[PDB]
Amino acid sequence: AYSPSTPVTGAAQTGFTSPTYTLTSDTAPTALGKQHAVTATGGTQTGVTTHSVSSPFTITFTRPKTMKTVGVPNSNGVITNIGRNTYGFLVRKGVIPAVNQSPQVMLVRVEISVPAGADTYDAANVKAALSAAIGVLSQQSAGIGDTALSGIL
Amino acid sequence: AYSPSTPVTGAAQTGFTSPTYTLTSDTAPTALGKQHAVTATGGTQTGVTTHSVSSPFTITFTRPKTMKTVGRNTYGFLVRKGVIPAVNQSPQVMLVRVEISVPAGADTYDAANVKAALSAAIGVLSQQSAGIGDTALSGIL
Amino acid sequence: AYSPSTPVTGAAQTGFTSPTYTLTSDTAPTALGKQHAVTATGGTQTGVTTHSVSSPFTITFTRPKTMKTVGVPNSNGVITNIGRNTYGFLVRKGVIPAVNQSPQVMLVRVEISVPAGADTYDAANVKAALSAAIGVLSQQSAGIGDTALSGIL
Amino acid sequence: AYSPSTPVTGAAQTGFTSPTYTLTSDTAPTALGKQHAVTATGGTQTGVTTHSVSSPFTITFTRPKTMKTVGVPNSNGVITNIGRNTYGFLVRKGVIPAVNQSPQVMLVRVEISVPAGADTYDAANVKAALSAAIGVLSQQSAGIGDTALSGIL
Amino acid sequence: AYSPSTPVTGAAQTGFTSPTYTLTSDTAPTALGKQHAVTATGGTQTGVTTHSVSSPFTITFTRPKTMKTVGVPNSNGVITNIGRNTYGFLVRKGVIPAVNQSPQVMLVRVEISVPAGADTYDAANVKAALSAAIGVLSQQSAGIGDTALSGIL
């Protein structure tokens, strides 16, 4: 159930005052992805470039090709091999490294590996891992940006 | 500048009412990481298990060993959660991992676009947190 | 949750009046250890040498590399092998054996072996073993020093 | 000079309110050891099991079989080999790993290695190492329990 | 005992009037290092850039992984092999070589090799070497900068 909104209220960043990003719908590279492009920016973020082909701003979310089931316990009551379905959330952003050099692609990618029997037997802990991860990310968004520029923890 | 707060307001999830997670400071596996463990949960999230030896609940953030001058510097944010796959099985480790790859000259020459990538990414994550959990259980986008 | 205080009140010893040890943070040998070193001594403990390169005074506490889970019971209801995670607490002290000899390293080392399922199922008994061990050590600290010097049990 | 008291004030632990352990004299495994066994517990430590045949609670302290003398310096004034006499303090506690499993033996063991000439020439530093080790243990008893259960350092 | 202060009063340089450097605490690359980053500059130094990831300003100080002891004299009264513990102090600074080229890393590194038995037997001469070296460095700081640019002794 992944469906973003037209203005996404961007997580707080150091020099940004109330930043929002307008999403336009885009066709995803796989058939297993939903992708949006950041067509325009709102808020007092100065210098932020929107989505081009050579300088992209893309938010794509993908499901695995083949689902994996939990399987069945063996003679010792132990399930031999627990595969894991991983869902992928990836942001590509055009970033300019040098004074005249051409845009490179900064990349922010998230992988959510859910074990096989998890999604059904223990859903609360799955949801809890996701909420803790995203809550820490949104809490420390500004500081993680500061670190991405400073190199300091 | 990565330093979490004692109660972390956890992102919205489907069955959770006002979920918060209490972090206790932990020693990280590398000398380049800061790690906290989820010692207790607050809010109406029934069944959620906290950090145990058998099933961990850990939030670790790491910087690269060597910085690159102008290549990519990648910073890593990883959450490990004890999740039980079957009726009597040993806990498996669900894993949510984030990698932030900043090009070399980016951090200095174009900092606004770096911060904007991070802002968009985390903002979409927090907006769709509930739906991404729904997807992690459904298998459907 | 291991974090010592700046002045550590040292356990009673025979010739010592109110002995305290100032700990300075030191970097541990492994990445899974926390180490402090005794930079200075307070109290009436005459002759006590602090940490030097030649004669160290170090207090290091380490957790195991890989934690061990309890395991799954078999058809009979029996769990086949209970591994044990051991935590280690070790003090190294520079001590001079003869009139002109190089310092030797007296060594006080504790090992706490907790079985695999214990830490979760029966935590009260784990805590009780620890509190009894450390309580007997602190009660008989002066007497154990007397023994370590006398050979008298 | 090792002789514990009838109620041993147990070191502070997380869930325990004023915990004490009654020791009953027990006969040691070697002839060079003194052993007591925890016959009963006092204080608010709920669930703590005393010494049974199936799950023991034992505190044994042993001195080495053969003491080692410092030795004679050679022509250069150097003593060739400094042996070390080690005294041993060991607590064994019955701890149950799973819901229906047989009790495992949690094990807390201390070793005090004193070099050969130390006990006579430099006794203050020996006593100081012991008092610092035991003082840090009693200061961080609750925290070391928290670590032994959490895996958190 | 290495702990710098918030404003470090920088050693005199040719074009600089009363320069100071603000240090912010940073995580060091090894577990054996303490590292600070120059987050901001004070004084009338014009053009000086502060710490970025691609243009760093870092002051890191490291101890050796394993200490070395003096050892013991052989049959002739001579100590066969005197190892040396070296401590390392290193400053990395982003410097721009060309008109549009990207920042390179100027590097100022100090190595202090202390022989094994030195640190204990002859500490005054160790301290004296350090004080003479650092005193000549601070006396000729401006002139060493002049040389770093001129190529002239």
Place this chain on the structure above:
Amino acid sequence: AYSPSTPVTGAAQTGFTSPTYTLTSDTAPTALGKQHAVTATGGTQTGVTTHSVSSPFTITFTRPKTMKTVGRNTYGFLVRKGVIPAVNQSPQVMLVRVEISVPAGADTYDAANVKAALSAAIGVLSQQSAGIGDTALSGIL
């Protein structure tokens, strides 16, 4: 432009009260070096031994053989001190060596940052001189 003064005000050290070192001019080992020897000490630094044949006290500063046009030009500052390890042993040479590696185009295009690196380095060294001696004897940072 490296030319030391006759009494060098030595950096603060733990047991030293107002230490100064008198330099006498010496011939260097290479033709690219200027070297002085510490012929005498002033101040309350008891036990400090001056330059002898058996135990040297020397301060030598060297430029590279060939300059590099736009690679690195490294300048070297090295102090050798006679230090005695045991009760009757021969003197060992404690060694304090500094290397200043300037990139090729740096010296001309960006001189302020070069001078600033040198300023920060020497300023922290002089600020923590006493503590760095304490560390050289303790083994502890």
Place this chain on the structure above:
Amino acid sequence: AYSPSTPVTGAAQTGFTSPTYTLTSDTAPTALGKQHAVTATGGTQTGVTTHSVSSPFTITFTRPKTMKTVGVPNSNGVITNIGRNTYGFLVRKGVIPAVNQSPQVMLVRVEISVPAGADTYDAANVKAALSAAIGVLSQQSAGIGDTALSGIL
């Protein structure tokens, strides 16, 4: 007997009005050289850069490592092998080839090869070769510059 003066009056060049070059004393690369660096320029020469490490302005003069003597005539009254001592005078100047490219090193080098018995037996002709060479150089200095830029004789 080579010792230049503080302002060297530079030989006439096309666009230069009364050019002078200030020499500062420099340490030479060999032990057999005397080297000066052009620290500053006087006269109406516009665009002339002084001595840097990456853009040098150096005037170095070197003698041979080993002198050679004339030798002795053989049975036919002929001296079999007349070696030659060569003295070297070399000027290095930072010159910028492209619009943004980095400085390359223009190089003006003079070699004076004096045969062995010459320096003693026939000194007048040695001095005469030197004076004619340097006199033609100073006479055609402007024109040789014109040629160095034009490619025209």
